[PDB]
Amino acid sequence: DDSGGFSTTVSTEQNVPDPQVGITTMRMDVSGVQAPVGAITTIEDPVLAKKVPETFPELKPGESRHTSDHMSIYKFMGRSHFLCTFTFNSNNKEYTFPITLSSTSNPPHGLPSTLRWFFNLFQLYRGPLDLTIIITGATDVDGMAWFTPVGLAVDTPWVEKESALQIDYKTALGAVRFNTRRTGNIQIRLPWYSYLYAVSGALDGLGDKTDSTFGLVSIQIANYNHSDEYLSFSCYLSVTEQSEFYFPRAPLNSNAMLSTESM
Amino acid sequence: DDSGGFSTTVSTEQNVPDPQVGITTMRMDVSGVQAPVGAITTIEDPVLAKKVPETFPELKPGESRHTSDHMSIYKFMGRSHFLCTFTFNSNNKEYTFPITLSSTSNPPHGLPSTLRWFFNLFQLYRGPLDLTIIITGATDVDGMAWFTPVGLAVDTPWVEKESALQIDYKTALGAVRFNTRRTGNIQIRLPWYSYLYAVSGALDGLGDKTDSTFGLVSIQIANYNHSDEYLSFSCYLSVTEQSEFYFPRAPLNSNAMLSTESM
Amino acid sequence: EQMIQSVDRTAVTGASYFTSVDQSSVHTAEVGSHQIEPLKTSVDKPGSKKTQGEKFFLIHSARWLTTHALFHEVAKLDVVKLLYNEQFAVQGLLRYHTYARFGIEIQVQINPTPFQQGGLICAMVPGDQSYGSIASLTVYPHGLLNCNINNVVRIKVPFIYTRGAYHFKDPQYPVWELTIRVWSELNIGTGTSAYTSLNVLARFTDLELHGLTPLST
Amino acid sequence: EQMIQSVDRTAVTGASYFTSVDQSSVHTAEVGSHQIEPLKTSVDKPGSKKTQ
Ligand SMILES: [Cl-]
Ligand SMILES: [Cl-]
Ligand SMILES: [Cl-]
Ligand SMILES: [Cl-]
Fold first, then answer.
1. Chain B residue with minimal CA distance to C38?
2. Contacts of B244 in chain C (CB under 8 A)
């Protein structure tokens, strides 16, 4: 140990990341007609506990019928999962929602379902995210959206109100404009712009207010005479290849897994 | 600088020990018919100040007529100088005097004349010392003497009294016995036995009580019917080649140079 | 033509994080040099970052009882925060640097008499336990204790945080929250001691200190 | 021993028939350099003794 420490017994890796593949394949038997020594061990000892488990004679499983391995985070979370949804009531108004891993913030004012679950499987996250948002209802409604990084000015969260920000400021942080008639959906990438090294969901109050946020999104409508239908917005997030995940946590207990029950 | 320090100007040795010999010899002119650049300098600057002084044209001095260099500490202090003197009044009594560099302790209860002067020219001393003591007066008086190291039991200093120490103990520290009739003088070497690295004269109270002492000498008489003459003892010390002297101090000012005025 | 030496006006000196600019300077005087003890006055490694900072210290110590129900938290500790305290030498380093990053080594030990039975689990959890499943604590760098088996466990981890370092004087959120819970109720036979005390040891590893500061809070 | 740069007191500047002697001088600051029109703004010989 370079830290000036010494020991007589060893120190092996405990709970090592990505140990085996997630699809049945051959990376004979898997164990058999020999003697299952891995049927007994002293779990308290980290070394011994890694001894491969084996109890009876088995054969090699074989090959899975499907191409890709569904257990590769990149591919799994590659399926843009649900994030949140809101609805505009008056014209020339705006909504601003934060992207917060916080296990504390319960939906709708917080991370829901899968996304909630996923982001609490590990301690640190960093890297871009591909947000995609679906428009529901209205038509011929001009709209705009911008990504605001943690620690900067931005209209009050989880609240529909008249923007209090200079058009200049908004556009300046990089923004996008669209119209319900011509589209009905937007898929744009959110940058890893933060003064932190990474963000986390599992935290306590204080840090849970600064270090638990990727950033924020703000959507502002225009030309929406409410003589028209209603205007709904739904947001979904998908992890990118440039996204990283460090240190595995114990998954959230079921009682804390919540979902925004609707339809 | 290995200490993580940096500088732009240099750092030369200041006041270097044993710079030149002490006897006129050639270790042409010493300076002349050139230009005395060493006639001017900025004494405040350590470097410049070392520039060799020269004001006028001089010739080489030549050779001294005497063999040895009187300025070599070893040879100079090689002349056993005066230390102290005391006189016994009753029989079967003993005297114990400490060898203390302390500039504080004024004689007779302290270092006198030359020895006083010398031991304050530098900060640290260590190494054996050749003590030699002259007996005056009486005769057929059996006597004994022993060297006691700093920090151990020993009869009360600067005081004539009846010893309070086991004959065993005394002899144990290494002792010597003699008789006035057969001799009248004793030259024995004092060892560098101390728990310290070195001792010093210039100190303040506290340390001036523990770290300012080589050790102590104790002389005990016997068979001295005071119907006889008086018994006087005189001690002198001479530095040995195994003696070391570290770091030069500013010499004691004259007012502090004291001598035990007698005859 | 002979040039005659004149002092060097301007100059710059300093050491570590202290610099001086002097306009009416002169050279520096030095005497003698560094001496090495031919006979050392002390044989221990001379003080160093590792000596004083990367060594072990007793953090907290509690009791584990027969009364403690399953999953009972026998201890919840802000490991880092705990070390930062006059009580331990490492403070001397922390007390003067604003931030620092590092790894940790934890040693937890107890002394159950073979007539006792049951066990505990010790986990190094970053930040807060949040709402993680108590039953899945094994996921975190952990150590399991079983009376019939071991009476000690050791865990070693690197720097894991959202920030590039921890701020002592005024932290954001604890780096590590070491949790110790009852993994299997501690029962015994009539007469045996109904408890066992427990201690926790901690030390920094690869201690990177940054920014000397005079503050204290 | 590292020598540390200190300005050059005295100096002499000028152009054509004008000279200056300065005692508490310093160096001259300049930016960019002469540019030649890749597309001339005028095609006549630049003014010269002969021109005029
Ligand atoms: Cl409003
Ligand atoms: Cl006679
Ligand atoms: Cl007496
Ligand atoms: Cl005789």
1. B197
2. none
Q: Resolution of this PDB entry, in A?
A: 3.0
- The answer to whether D6 contacts chain B (CB < 8 Å) is no
> Given this structure, which CATH class describes domain C1-217?
mainly beta
Asked whether the beta carbons of A75 and A25 are under 8 A apart, the reply is: no
CA angle A91, A111, A158 (to 5 degrees): 30
Cα torsion C123, C125, C130, C136 to 10°: value is -40
- The residue type of B26 is M
Taking CA atoms, what residue in D is nearest to B10?
D1
Query: Testing the interface with C: which of B45, B48, B126 to mutate, by most C Cβ within 10 A?
Result: B45
Q: Which of C173, C206, C207 to mutate to test the interface with A (most CBs of A within 10 A)?
A: C173
Q: Looking at the partner chain, which of A4, A14, A248 has a beta carbon nearest the beta carbon of C50? A: A4
Pairing of strands B244-248, C176-188: unpaired
User: How far away, in angstroms, is A143 Cα from ligand 1 center?
Assistant: 18
Asked how this structure was determined, the answer is X-ray
Nearest to B22 by CA among B67, B69, B68, B62: B69
- Taking contacts as CB-CB distances below 8 angstroms, the residues of chain D near C10 are 4, 6
Element (H, E) at C93: helix C91-94
The reply to whether C109 touches chain A by the CB within 8 Å rule is no
Q: Which residues, 6+ apart, have CB-to-CB distance to A70 below 8 Å? A: A22, A23, A76
How far apart are alpha carbons C189 and B97 in whole angstroms? 74
Compute the distance from residue B139 Cα to the ligand 2 centre, in Å.
9
Which residue of chain A is at minimal alpha-carbon distance from C139?
A: A250
Q: B73: burial class by Cβ within 10 Å (0-12, 13-18, 19+)?
A: middle
* Domain segments of chain A as ranges: 1-263
Give the number of whichever ligand sits closest to the CA of residue B183: 4
SS3 C79: helix
Q: In angstroms, rounded to a whole number, what is the distance separating the alpha carbons of residues A126 and A120?
A: 14
Q: Is C94 helix (H, G, I), strand (E, B) or coil?
A: helix
Question: What does the alpha-carbon distance between residue C101 and residue C168 come to, in Å, rounded to a whole number?
Answer: 11
Angstrom distance (rounded) from CA A132 to CA A135: 10
Both tokens of B120, joined, read 């304050």
Given 3.40.50.12780, 2.60.120.20, 2.40.50.140, 2.120.10.30, which CATH number is that of A1-263? 2.60.120.20
Longest CA span, chain A: 79
* C-alpha span between C193 and C183 (Å, rounded): 19
Residue bearing tokens 């002592």: C168
Burial track B149-185 (b if 16+ CB lie within 10 A, e otherwise): bbeeebbeeeebeebebeeeebeebebeebebeeeee
The DSSP H or E segment spanning B168 is helix B167-172
